[PDB]
Structures are given as structure tokens and as C-alpha cells.
Design a protein around this ligand. Structure first.
Ligand SMILES: Nc1nc2c(ncn2[C@@H]2O[C@H](COP(=O)(O)OP(=O)(O)OP(=O)(O)O)[C@@H](O)[C@H]2O)c(=O)[nH]1
Ligand SMILES: Nc1nc2c(ncn2[C@@H]2O[C@H](COP(=O)(O)OP(=O)(O)O)[C@@H](O)[C@H]2O)c(=O)[nH]1
Ligand SMILES: Nc1nc2c(ncn2[C@@H]2O[C@H](COP(=O)(O)OP(=O)(O)O)[C@@H](O)[C@H]2O)c(=O)[nH]1
Ligand SMILES: [Mg+2]
Lengths: 49, 441, 116, 430, 53, 44, 428
């Protein structure tokens, strides 16, 4: 509940577990490519949109 | 932050640690389990315990002490006792076999085995620590561990920490009664090697406390526990200015500095007043004048030496309770205006006054009554040279026949160190005589 | 290896302010530049060339254990204020008796203040 | 109009610029989706300096995210403003450098250079009149300190006149997080000294210091550090985007700060870094602003200007003020401390104002200063590199990539040329 | 001039309010950290009872 | 009961206990931290 | 304009500064939060002499609280008027000096001399035309008497022309609470003579004398003592902050009090001290105000001026009076007690009037006076220092700090040559 400025930021990660990372990006058909648009974010959790 | 880390050595060290830490826990409010009898974690509250206790991540407090004893049972009683969960297990260090009243064994053979482990534990405790005021080290001159291993611990602590204060509470051998035959040998070989390695010294004999507890508290049958309560009260009054606020607070370095005039001599005598029973205090009004007059009585010192057989060179004084500076000054004037109390020529003002607000707490099952005011004293006087002379007399008449030296020589110490230590104390007594002499023409 | 200087922020790295409550490493406060580039001093796998000078002393540091230390350690704090001449001399002799304790890394360097 | 392409290299580059694009999205009123939700009309008047228009009323930052590893780009996408970047800008390969400057510069980045040049030239063509580019990287890594310089050297040949800024991160003396740090640092700064218009020296141990000193944060994470750096990057081009009573651009700041072409290293600072105890006891007024501006503790470098002579000083102000106080207070620092400013340059300070303050704040400024105290960084790297280069230590990794040993000689001789030439300008008679 | 002084007082009040919000948020954050530590300790107590028995 | 603050015009309590001094000023890492002083002398 | 930055050193300094910052807040009507709640306009007319402006209608003291031990701060910061100080101005280390003057002055005071000189510098340059700093400390301490000199010696070089006061505290002979009190005081007066514009020698034992016999307070806390001293430091700069029929300042007194630069030690005074029941039988008038002042019982020094010659005298009066009486009363004492006043200086007394009385009171006055009877203190301390120093006692503490031994000899010699020069002006 603070205006966004240096200092006015608090890490929400306190209390969160399972900091798994997804496999966005990758080379298929010998092509640099964002593989799959439907992968979750950090924690196996959905993105925005 | 304020800080004193405890290095209790020996059976006396462990029992004194028991009494002192029970008193500290009851005084601050800590349970024998370690957590406060509440939750009290919505914010950071009173942290005055931080000079003795250490916070943990679980909301528990761990004492800043390291119990060391070279035999198992004295520490196993602690491990099974009521406070068995107050102490972190790695802090209390024990050994399979003890020195068995042998400074040589406690200094060369068995003492050097557990030097590294205790030093590493001390290193971790000091690592935990921000503003370290001092190391409080309590032991006895008689027993093998409390003499030899404590001496070697001091000697290596000098290497590990160049400037930190290493305060020394000592159980000095009683002049007549004793619990050992070979105790003068440990007594002479201890002070000789700690003379250049110790900062101050608070030696007390158990005999004088026996007389005090009989005469005043009406306990016809005392015990080491009843004595350890008084010793814990003394240490409490020493560190009260660190723990709580006062009209005039005083750290450790202040009364180290205003007590020792010359580098070799560092041997104050302590005093507590008043120590009276509840019946005795029912009828007796207590004030600053009464308590500071009782502080100077020869029948109240916990060392068997009458300071009227000498001259004071310094007096640190520690008031505690509902005391008032105006009455303190009146009492100082009325003790200065007496010839029965002498002072050396060079010291016109030989007083160092500290004041604390909080009256001393009472532990259940004790002997003292609950009193609104009290006073502690550390007097550096020259009337202790007679004690060293008696000690040298006993050591001499033992040492003429080379009695008990077969025990000591084998373990790794030569017999020439005996003569060297005796000669060092011979020089020390003459130093005391030069100090006590007055330059009046 | 070398502990350099944070200049303005050196008090944040002062040895006592980092909870290390023992005497500590020296802190080099000054630096000097060298013109040109640098010659090779060592062979492959870090073997010093025959032509270069090579310093003495053990390549294993200098650490002394419990049984390696002398049996009579003199203190660091030496204050020769009121001592006699011969007492001053003998305490200085005790201090300088074992140079190995002085050269050891975990050994002590005493401070000697005053004159008899 | 006047456009900037924000380059990006390495984990430091991606993590710093991930925060940077957020703080300028908030300044321009852009949601994480990418649409315009601001209220003031000036919030979208000069948006084309950075943003590129998309169909449906959306905006794409003109960034090129480069790193040899696909690792951090997953975290970049998983951030709060993760999908604001168009995916085709993400350029990456298989195997990183592993803090090896050689692999990034020669054997692995030389495959990745051609693709990045394609995206960069595509963005370069789209804008009409591009001012310049802007690269963020660290000198203690393998990619940003490695191939990140090879992007610099190639692009300068293609576009000579355009300005190139570099918000580099230099290693710190007291605590390091890479053991081959002086090998990459002493050989990357040689690339900067030949091909760079300006570099800002940002050191982390200074950044760790400021959070505790001026803000009193118990746990300052790398996000708070990265936001602290990104406030500087906004502060140099705020006058570029928003109108002011007395304006300036990157080139206007460029001309007045380099007296000679060898000198393009500065130490920045941010003014209203105010602590959560001190807001209660404070009066937001411009002498208090320049008071905290020139205090050496507020620098974000590992050098103390009190040890050297200030060549030229920049003060880029944000907010609506009265300029008499701006001119007076600058003059007071100019004359009260005479010995810290060079004598052959009268009026060593350049001032500029930007009418619109940072969002949620009333008064601010940023400081850019060219000092001779920065030479204390180069000699320190030189000795730490030389002592490691005496015994041929950690060298089999680099010469096994095919590099000869001789570039280390010229990279340290050029570097020690700079410290000697810097020194002569300090001890110069008017 | 009265308008100018009202402007300054308004900016000061906004500044102070943002401070108060920041302090309250830190205190809540410290509370959450303590709660997480206590949950870890209770998990440890359960597994410790298992390990002893 | 609101007598003016003149020299030697003040009264003190005779029954307050505890007198606990709390650690507001403190050190953390290599820095000095000044904690906001709640919890006055003695807890109240 | 005319600003004063109030220094601070040690537990003595922190407890006097806490009370002193309490009382001026009442004259200027400043509440514990820091805001202003006074009702008279002139209560806020020259507040910027001591306070500095902050947003929200808030004012912060211009203080620099310094101590080697943080423990004194925590007691200060938990008082009623403890949260009014800005936190950045606190300067504090990790370990103290333990009543050792050398540890304060040379070894440990060095590490805290950088930060304190910064805190004053930021505050020195904040104010446009700074009148002068001001320090309170004790000579019987380790930090106040210790590094507390090292600030003074340093800032004289930086700001020579500005005026340095010191309400320093001198040890008392009859009751002493430090054994090494002679060595600190001997090595501090030697600092005081060379680097000080003006000094006020206040002794706590005389404060005990005043409270016991005049006010007859049964339980004099150290808060009562500091109130006695805080009221003095208000009365010296009250003419600075409030207008009068004849105005004055710090420099006006210091110029008109120091005939030769070596003499800057003055005995303060404060007139309206009455017991609880004495105000029933009293009469608030100017002759009574001058009568209660010149009595030696009212002085907070440890020397009776009846044994020496009053060199010069300052009297600053508080309250709207008629100065027909103040000139006639000042002449009456000058002409009656002619032997105790010096002869080569006529009209020895300086007077000034500040119209605004202290809050809750109708009339008041304060007094600053230079006598030759003070040397009864330096002479008295010297033998206590000398008798210690023949035997080289308590010296290993000092010699272990690295200082040589000739510092004791010269500081003795400056101390003895001062009283020798001071003695000559008595017999002139
Ligand atoms: N005042 C007091 N003295 C004690 C206490 N316990 C032991 N002593 C004294 O300590 C001396 C002998 O040393 P101890 O502590 O008993 O044993 P130690 O120090 O462990 O030495 P070793 O038995 O050889 O291992 C005896 O003369 C006792 O008078 C105690 O609890 N209080
Ligand atoms: N300021 C800042 N520095 C960072 C951050 N992340 C990494 N670094 C610095 O980057 C260096 C390591 O960078 P590295 O990952 O090897 O860069 P790369 O090799 O180009 O990918 C370290 O010295 C860090 O100090 C960050 O978020 N902020
Ligand atoms: N007048 C006065 N003197 C005080 C006060 N508090 C302490 N002192 C004196 O200060 C002397 C000790 O000062 P000390 O605490 O050692 O000073 P520091 O070492 O600089 O902190 C004692 O002689 C006290 O009489 C006070 O509130 N008022
Ligand atoms: Mg035993």
C-alpha cells in the first residue's frame, strides 16, 4: 500500500515454498523458440492472462 | 550491546554457575525451559537479558556460559537437573578423568586435551556476540582442574583475545580449615602463572562466609548452596549496572581501572551488605549509613584478613535500590572522617561510586530477606599480604622435604618451576611492602 | 588473500564491527600503479622459474597447536611503568625468548609500552 | 524522434533491466498487459523515446534481452512485468561461459553475435532518428563482460556517431563473488576505453552500504538494489522525455563531462534516498537536497572523491523548484570546498532541471561526477590481475580457447596508461 | 502566498503518511517471518518425537 | 496539580518496580541501527 | 542568523542535556511529539537559534549526543522528551574508556572523531550565521573529559572565530566518586586553558549544599540537580531569544568578562531559590533578588569568593523591572563590599535586561562572575594530582595507551603557572 519508489517494496516470498522454475524457451526444429504458451510461473503457479 | 561470557571451571565453577544462572533466570523472567511464560512476540520488547541470554529463531533463550569440569558427574547433575533444557548441549563440556588435586595433571597431561574444544566453543559464543564487555571466569585454587586447566585457559585466552577483560572470581584457600593436603602447591603454581595474565581477582574463602552465615543469617548448619547464593548475589550486583539503568551506571572496565594501581598487584576483597535474616531485619531500620558502616567491619569481610592490619589503596562501591546521592555523600564523608580506616599517602580520593535503581531480587528457598537497599564493595587493600605470607609458610614447610613432589614431577613439570614460583611470590610480598610504606619525613 | 580498503566504507568492515572479536588482519590503505605490462614468473603448473628469486619459510603457513606452543606463554600486554631495570630486562627476555611464537600466524605479537 | 534502444547482457543485465522497464512503465502509466492507463497527457507525449507502438493500442519496449544461457529468461518471464517484452527479442544459446570471458568473447558469443545484430538492426531501422543505445552488464561475469563488449565493438563500427551508454557493474575489493574476476575485468575495461561514450561505475558493496545507511533496510534483497540502480537510469533521460524550464539530453551531458576522449568513467548518486526514521524529522527543501547529493557516502562507487579532484560535476534535477536556490547552492559547494575541484576549469558544475518529478515524489535529483578518484579502482584491478597473472594462474582456461598471452599485456598496459594519464591531470598547474 | 504554504503543508502530510504506512508494513512482515519460524520449529518437534521414539 | 516547571519542583513515584533498560541503539552487520523506542523504562 | 549547536559528551552530558532540552521546550511551548502548542506569538519568534525546522510543523534540537557507551542513550531515548531527537545525530561506538582519560582521548576516541565531526559539519552549515557551539561534560569521566577534549581542540582549528562555551563539571574534593579523578581533570584543564572561550565551573557537591539547606528537598534526585544547571544555561542566552530593555548575548558577556585570554573560568548563579514555605514569607522585589544572589550559599561552585577578589561580574536579569533599582542595587553592593572588588577596574559589573520572565514565575535573574577565589580549586586539585604522581601510581593504565610521561609534567606546569599568574592579579 505504498507508492512505487526505492525502499517502498516488500518481498512477498516470505512464507512461500516450492520455488520451482519452468522450462520456457528452447530449441526445437533447430529453431530458437518460446516453447509452449501455457506453462506456469515460479512455484508451478499461473501467470497473468 | 552489553556482554559478559561465563567460563566456569571446576566443580566450584559448575555449582556457582548453577546458583548464578538460577538467579539470572528468576531475575529477568525466563522460565527454566527457556521461553517466556507467554507468547509476547507481536513486537520486540524488553531485551535487557541480551547481556546474558541469547535469542534464537524459535523464541528461546540460551545462556552465554561454558561449564567445564574434568569429571562427568558434576555436569551430569546439570544435564539431568530442573534446568535441563535451558542449556544447549554442546556448551557443557566434560572429561573422562580428572586431575585429582594435581596442578601438573590439570596443566600438562589431561588439561591440554580439552583446550581446543573449549576454545572453539568460546569462539562460537564470541562470534554470536556484538559488544563484548568481558569474560567472567570463576574457579578455585585448590582443585586440579580449577587450578591447572583454568591457568592454561587464561594463558591461551591471552593469545586468543589480546585486550578483552578476563575477570577472575577465585576460591582462595582458607587459612586454617581445608579440604586438601596438596592445595598449597596448586595455590603457589596458579598465581605465579596467572600474575601477568589475569586482569583482576575477587578471591574469597569459604571460611569467612561460614562465619558470616552463622553470625548474621542464623543458619547454624550452612551448605555450599547457601554460600553459592551469596556469590551469585555478588556477581548480580557487579553486572546490575550493565543489565538495568541507574543514577550512575558502571561498566566492567571502569572498576577494573579504578581499583588496581600497579601492574603486578590485582587482588581486591569483596564485601556485601546487609546480609541479615528476616527476623533480624524486622526490628532493624536499614539506611545508607548503616549499610556502608557494615561494609567496613572486619567481621564482615569474606576473606580472613582484618584491614585494620593494613591500609586501603582503593574502594569500588556499588549501591543498589532506593539509595540517594546526598546520603551517599554523607556516608562517604562520615567514613573518611575516621582514623580506624587508614588510606595510603598517594590516594586522597580512593572511591569509585556506582548507583543502580533496581533492588536485589529474592530467590525462594534462600536466606536473605527482601531489602529495599544494598551495597557491594571491592576494596584493594594491603592487609592481604599476611595471607600470602601464611601461604608461603605452609608451602615452605611442605617443600623442605620435597613431599608430594613425586606426583607433580612425573606428569611433565620440572621441580625448578616450584622454586621459580616460590621466588615470584617472595618478590610479590616485598612489592606489597613497598606499596604499604609511606613517604612521610 | 589481500584485504583492500573500502575507503569511505572501511568502518563497515572494521574487524570489531564484523563481530570478529580478536586481533585481526592488516588492511592496506594505499595502492600504487606500475607502468607497462608484467613478466612471466612461473612455468606451467605454477613452477617458479630458476632465474627468479624465491623466499624462505615453510610453504605450509605457520600454525601452532596445543602441543606445539611453548609451555610458558608471555602476555601481549606489557606495561613497564614502575618495574626495576632488571625486572624490565628479564620480562623483555621472556618476550623475546621464542621468536617462533612471534612468527606464527596464530601466535601473538605483544605491545610493549614504557621505560623502567 | 529521439529514440533509445535498451541493450541487455548477462544475469546482471537482465535482472537490472527487468526492474528498469517496470519503473519506466509506472512513470508512463503502462499496465503489465501493456496498455495505456495513465491520466496525465504528458505521460504519453514522448513515449516513443523507448516504447514501440503495437496494434490494439499496446506498447513494446525497445529491448534486446541477450544471455548465453536460457536460465534467467524463465525468471524474467515469470516476473510481474514478464510478458511486456515481445518474445522475438529474447536471444540466447545453449552453453554459457561459466564466468569465462574467453568463451563469451571468442568461442561461443561469436555464434550469437549475428542473431543479436539482426534484432538490433531491426529496432535501429524502425525509429527515424535514434539518439543512441544503452547497455547494462557486469564486468565480473562471462557474457555481459564477455560478448557484451563484442556487441559494443561491432555496433560502434556500424554506427559511429550515436551515443553508447554503459551502466556497467564493476567488481568490488572487499568481497568478491568470482575468483577469475580481475581477469575478465582488466580485459573488458580495455574494450570500454576504446569503444564507449560514457560508462557509469556502479559497485554493489556501495549499494549494500546505502540501503543500511540512508534507508535502514534490515533485508535489502537484490530487487531493492536493482531498483536503486534503475532510478539512476531514469534520472539521466527524464529531461529527454519530460519538458523542463532548463532541459538537457544525453548528448548535452556528454559534451560537458568528457574533457578528453580517454575519460568517460563517473560515479552517480540519487538525492532523495530518505530513511523511514528520517521522514518524520525532515524538511524537503533544495539545500537539504544538495546536502545529501555531495556527501561522499551517497556515491554508488568504491572510490572516495575526497581523495581526488572533481573534474566536472553534473546535477540533473527533477521537480518544479526555484532556480535561484539551484544556482546559489551549487555555488556554495563550488567555493567552500576549493581543493576538491580542478583549477583550470572554472565552474565545474553543470545543472539541468526537469519539471515533472518522479511519480509519488515531490523533489529529487541525480548526480553525475567525473573524478580523478576513479583511478583508485583501476590500479586495484591492475594489481589483483597482475598478482594472478605473475604465476600463470587460472590461465589454462583462457589460452585453451585459442587466445594468445599477449592481449593480457596490452590490456594491462593500456589500463596502466590510463592511471598514469589520469594522475597527471590531478597534479596539474593552472 | 497562502496557497504556496498550503501546498507545502500538503506535500509534508503526504510524506509523513507514506512513512507511517511503511513502518506498519514492516512490522507485519516481521510478524509473518516469526510465524514461519514457529511453523518450522513445530514440524521439527514432531519429527524429533518420531526420531526419539 | 499542574505546578509550573521550576528548579526543584518535581515528585517521583515510590512504588514502581522493574526499571528494565531496553536496547534501542544496537549494531547489525557492520552498521549502527537505532530502533524506534517503544516499551519504556520498566515495560510500561 | 544567530544559531547555537549544542554539543554533548558522556553520561554526565547526556543527563544534563536531557534535562536542558526539556526546559527550553517549555519556554518555547514544544510538546513531546515536536510540534508547537504555545499561545504567545513571541514564544515562536527566534526558535531557530536552537531548533531546526522540519516538515509538518515540527522542530528538532540542534544537538549532537555523543558517548562511547550506547547504554546512556537508551535511558535518554526512553524519557518523555526522548523521542524529539533526530536519530541520525546520535553517535556511539562499541566500547568505552572506563574512566580512563587516555583511552577516551587517544585510542578509542579516534574512531569516533570522524563521525562526530560529520554530524556537526552538517548542522554547522545548515545554519546561516552560526553564533557558536556549546558543550557540557564532566572532567571526572572517561568520554566527556576524554575525547570530549578532542572535539574542542579540533573544531577550534575549523571554526576559530565562533564562541565555545563549556558548562563543564569539576570534581569535588570532599566527596569523590572516581579514584583516577585527579589525572583526568589535570589533563583536561590543560586542554581547557588553551582552547576555550568561556567556562562555567559547576560542582555537584555545591548542588547538594543548595538543595539541602535552601530548598530543603528531602529526596533530591539527580533530576533536581540537572534542573538547577539547566536553568542556568537558559539564563545566559535568554537575551538572544527574547527582546529586552537592554539586550545582550554570549559575545557581549564574554567580551566584557575576560580581561586576559588565560582567565575564562566563571562561577554561575541563579537567584530565586526558595523552599516550599519560604514563598509565603517572601517579597518578590529586586533588592531581595540581589540579596539572595551574592550570598555564597547560593553559588554552585566549591569556592567562597570572600577569600578572593571579584575580578569582574555579570548579572543578567529576567523580567520587566525598573532599572532605577537595578543600577542603584548594583552600586550598593559595589560600594559596601569594596575590599572584595578589584581596584584597577572600576564599574566592575555588566548588566542586561530580558523582559520575558521564565514560565510560571514573575521575576528571575542569573549571574556570571570571575573571581580570584576560584584558584582555591586548581590549587586544591593539584596536590591531589601531585601526591598521586610522586609514586607513579595508577600510571600503567595511562602509560599503556602509548602516551609518554612528559604530558603529566607539562599539564602540571600549565596548571601551576595558571594559578601563579592568577595569584598575581589578586595582589596588584
Ligand atoms: N565456595 C565454594 N567452593 C567450592 C565449591 N565446590 C568446591 N569448592 C572448593 O573447591 C576446592 C577443590 O576444587 P573442586 O572444585 O572441589 O574440584 P575441581 O576444581 O574440579 O578439581 P578436581 O577435583 O581435581 O577436578 C575445594 O577446596 C572446595 O573448597 C562450591 O560449590 N562453593
Ligand atoms: N547490482 C546487481 N548486480 C548483480 C545482480 N545479479 C548479478 N549481479 C552481479 O553480476 C555478477 C555475476 O554476473 P554473471 O551472472 O556472471 O553475468 P554474466 O556472466 O554476463 O551472465 C556478480 O558480481 C554480481 O555482483 C543484480 O540483480 N543486481
Ligand atoms: N552535574 C551532574 N553530574 C553528573 C550527572 N550524571 C553524572 N554526573 C557526574 O559525572 C561523573 C562521571 O561521569 P562519566 O559517566 O564517567 O562521564 P563519561 O565517561 O564521559 O560518560 C560523576 O562524577 C558524576 O558526578 C548529572 O546528571 N549531573
Ligand atoms: Mg574436581
Amino acid at each position: 500500500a505504498l507508492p512505487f519508489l526505492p525502499g517502498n517494496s516488500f518481498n512477498r516470498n516470505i512464507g512461500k515454498e516450492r520455488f520451482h522454475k519452468s522450462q520456457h524457451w528452447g530449441f526445437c526444429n533447430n529453431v530458437r523458440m518460446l516453447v509452449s504458451e501455457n506453462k506456469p510461473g515460479v512455484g508451478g503457479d499461473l501467470l497473468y492472462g | 550491546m552489553r556482554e559478559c561470557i561465563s567460563i566456569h571451571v571446576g566443580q566450584a565453577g559448575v555449582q556457582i554457575g548453577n546458583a548464578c544462572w538460577e538467579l539470572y533466570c528468576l531475575e529477568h523472567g525466563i522460565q527454566p525451559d527457556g521461553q517466556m511464560p507467554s507468547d509476547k512476540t507481536i513486537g520486540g520488547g524488553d531485551d535487557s537479558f541480551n547481556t546474558f541470554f541469547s535469542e534464537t529463531g524459535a523464541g528461546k533463550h540460551v545462556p552465554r556460559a561454558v561449564f567445564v569440569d574434568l569429571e562427568p558427574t558434576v555436569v551430569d547433575e546439570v544435564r539431568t537437573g530442573t534446568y535441563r533444557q535451558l542449556f544447549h548441549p554442546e556448551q557443557l563440556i566434560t572429561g573422562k578423568e580428572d586431575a585429582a588435586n594435581n596442578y601438573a595433571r590439570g596443566h600438562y597431561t589431561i588439561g591440554k586435551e580439552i583446550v581446543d574444544l573449549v576454545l572453539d566453543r568460546i569462539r562460537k559464543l564470541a562470534d554470536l556476540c556484538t559488544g563484548l564487555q568481558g569474560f567472567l571466569i570463576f574457579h578455585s585454587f585448590g582443585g586440579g582442574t580449577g587450578s591447572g586447566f583454568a591457568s592454561l585457559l587464561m594463558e591461551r585466552l591471552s593469545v586468543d583475545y589480546g585486550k578483552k577483560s578476563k575477570l577472575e572470581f577465585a576460591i582462595y584457600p582458607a587459612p586454617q580449615v581445608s579440604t586438601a593436603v596438596v592445595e598449597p602447591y596448586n595455590s603457589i603454581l596458579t598465581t605465579h602463572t596467572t600474575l601477568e595474565h589475569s586482569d583482576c581477582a575477587f578471591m574469597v574463602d569459604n571460611e569467612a562466609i561460614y562465619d558470616i552465615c552463622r553470625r548474621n543469617l542464623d543458619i547454624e548448619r550452612p551448605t555450599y548452596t547457601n554460600l553459592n547464593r551469596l556469590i551469585g548475589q555478588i556477581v548480580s550486583s557487579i553486572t546490575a549496572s550493565l543489565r538495568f539503568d541507574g543514577a550512575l551506571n558502571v561498566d566492567l572496565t571502569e572498576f577494573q581501572t579504578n581499583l588496581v594501581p600497579y601492574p603486578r598487584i590485582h587482588f581486591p576483597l569483596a564485601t556485601y551488605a546487609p546480609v541479615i535474616s528476616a527476623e533480624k531485619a524486622y526490628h532493624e531500620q536499614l539506611s545508607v549509613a548503616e549499610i556502608t558502616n557494615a561494609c567496613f567491619e572486619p567481621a564482615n569481610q569474606m576473606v580472613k584478613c582484618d584491614p585494620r592490619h593494613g591500609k586501603y589503596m582503593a574502594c569500588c562501591m556499588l549501591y543498589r535500590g532506593d539509595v540517594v546521592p546526598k546520603d551517599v555523600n554523607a556516608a562517604i564523608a562520615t567514613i573518611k572522617t575516621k582514623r580506624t580506616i587508614q588510606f595510603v599517602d598517594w590516594c586522597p580520593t580512593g572511591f569509585k561510586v556506582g548507583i543502580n535503581y533496581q533492588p536485589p531480587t529474592v530467590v525462594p528457598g534462600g536466606d536473605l530477606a527482601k531489602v529495599q537497599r544494598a551495597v557491594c564493595m571491592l576494596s584493594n587493600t594491603t592487609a592481604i599480604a599476611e595471607a600470602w605470607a601464611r601461604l608461603d609458610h605452609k608451602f615452605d614447610l611442605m617443600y623442605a622435604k620435597r613431599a608430594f613432589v613425586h606426583w607433580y614431577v612425573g606428569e611433565g613439570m620440572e621441580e625448578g618451576e616450584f622454586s621459580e614460583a616460590r621466588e615470584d611470590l617472595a618478590a610479590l610480598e616485598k612489592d606489597y611492602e613497598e606499596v604499604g610504606v609511606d613517604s612521610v619525613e | 588473500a589481500t584485504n583492500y580498503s573500502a575507503n569511505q566504507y572501511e568502518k563497515a568492515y572494521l574487524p570489531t564491527y564484523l563481530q570478529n572479536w580478536s586481533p585481526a588482519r592488516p588492511t592496506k590503505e594505499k595502492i600504487a600503479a606500475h607502468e607497462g605490462y608484467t613478466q612471466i614468473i612461473a612455468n606451467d603448473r605454477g613452477h617458479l622459474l630458476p632465474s627468479v628469486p624465491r623466499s624462505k619459510a615453510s610453504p605450509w603457513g605457520s600454525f601452532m597447536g596445543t602441543w606445539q606452543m611453548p609451555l610458558k606463554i608471555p602476555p601481549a600486554k606489557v606495561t613497564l611503568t614502575a618495574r626495576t631495570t632488571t625486572a624490565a630486562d628479564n620480562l623483555t627476555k621472556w618476550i623475546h625468548k621464542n621468536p617462533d611464537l612471534l612468527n606464527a600466524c596464530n601466535g601473538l605479537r605483544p605491545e610493549i609500552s614504557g621505560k623502567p | 524522434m529521439r529514440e533509445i534502444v535498451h541493450l541487455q547482457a548477462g544475469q546482471c543485465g537482465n535482472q537490472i533491466g527487468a526492474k528498469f522497464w517496470e519503473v519506466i512503465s509506472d512513470e508512463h502509466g503502462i499496465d503489465p498487459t501493456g496498455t495505456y492507463h495513465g491520466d496525465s497527457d504528458l505521460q504519453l507525449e514522448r513515449i516513443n523515446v523507448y516504447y514501440n507502438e503495437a496494434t490494439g493500442g499496446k506498447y513494446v519496449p525497445r529491448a534486446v534481452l541477450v544471455d548465453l544461457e536460457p536460465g534467467t529468461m524463465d525468471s524474467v518471464r515469470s516476473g510481474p512485468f514478464g510478458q511486456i517484452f515481445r518474445p522475438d527479442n529474447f536471444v540466447f544459446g545453449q552453453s554459457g561461459a561459466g564466468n569465462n570471458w574467453a568463451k563469451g568473447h571468442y568461442t561461443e558469443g561469436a555464434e550469437l553475435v549475428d542473431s543479436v545484430l539482426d534484432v538490433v538492426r531491426k529496432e535501429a531501422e524502425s525509429c527515424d532518428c535514434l539518439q543512441g543505445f544503452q547497455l547494462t552488464h557486469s564486468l565480473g561475469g562471462g557474457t555481459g563482460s564477455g560478448m557484451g563488449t563484442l556487441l559494443i565493438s561491432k555496433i560502434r563500427e556500424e554506427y559511429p556517431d550515436r551515443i553508447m551508454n554503459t551502466f556497467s557493474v564493476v567488481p568490488s575489493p572487499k568481497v568478491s563473488d568470482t575468483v577469475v574476476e580481475p581477469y575478465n575485468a582488466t580485459l573488458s575495461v580495455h574494450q570500454l576505453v576504446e569503444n564507449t561514450d560514457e560508462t557509469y561505475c556502479i559497485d554493489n558493496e556501495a549499494l549494500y552500504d546505502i540501503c543500511f545507511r540512508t534507508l535502514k533496510l534490515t533485508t535489502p534483497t537484490y530487487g531493492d538494489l536493482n531498483h536503486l540502480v534503475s532510478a539512476t537510469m531514469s534520472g539521466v533521460t527524464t529531461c529527454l522525455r519530460f519538458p523542463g524550464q532548463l532541459n538537457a539530453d544525453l548528448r548535452k551531458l556528454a559534451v560537458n563531462m568528457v574533457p578528453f576522449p580517454r575519460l568517460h568513467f563517473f560515479m552517480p548518486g540519487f538525492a532523495p534516498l530518505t530513511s523511514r526514521g528520517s521522514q518524520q524529522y525532515r524538511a524537503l527543501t533544495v539545500p537539504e537536497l544538495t546536502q545529501q547529493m555531495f556527501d561522499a557516502k551517497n556515491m554508488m562507487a568504491a572510490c572516495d572523491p575526497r581523495h581526488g579532484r572533481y573534474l566536472t560535476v553534473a546535477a540533473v534535477f527533477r521537480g518544479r523548484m526555484s532556480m535561484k536556490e539551484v544556482d546559489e547552492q551549487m555555488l556554495n559547494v563550488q567555493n567552500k570546498n576549493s581543493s576538491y575541484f580542478v583549477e583550470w576549469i572554472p565552474n565545474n558544475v553543470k545543472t539541468a532541471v526537469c519539471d515533472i518529478p518522479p511519480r509519488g515524489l515531490k523533489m529529487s535529483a541525480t548526480f553525475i561526477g567525473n573524478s580523478t578518484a576513479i583511478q583508485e579502482l583501476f590500479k586495484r584491478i591492475s594489481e589483483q590481475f597482475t598478482a594472478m597473472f605473475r604465476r600463470k594462474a587460472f590461465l589454462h582456461w583462457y589460452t585453451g580457447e585459442g587466445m594468445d598471452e599477449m592481449e593480457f599485456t596490452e590490456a594491462e598496459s593500456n589500463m596502466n596508461d590510463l592511471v598514469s594519464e589520469y594522475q597527471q591531470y590531478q597534479d596539474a598547474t593552472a | 502566498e497562502a496557497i504556496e504554504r498550503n501546498k507545502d503543508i500538503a506535500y509534508g502530510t503526504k510524506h509523513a503518511h507514506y512513512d507511517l504506512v511503511a513502518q506498519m508494513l514492516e512490522k507485519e512482515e516481521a510478524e509473518r517471518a516469526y510465524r514461519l519460524s514457529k511453523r518450522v520449529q513445530d514440524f521439527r518437534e514432531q519429527r524429533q518425537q518420531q526420531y526419539k521414539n | 496539580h499542574g505546578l509550573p516547571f521550576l528548579p526543584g519542583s518535581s515528585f517521583t513515584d515510590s512504588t514502581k518496580t522493574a526499571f528494565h533498560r531496553s536496547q534501542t541503539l544496537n549494531y547489525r552487520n557492520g552498521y549502527a541501527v537505532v530502533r524506534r523506542p517503544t516499551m519504556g523504562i520498566g515495560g510500561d
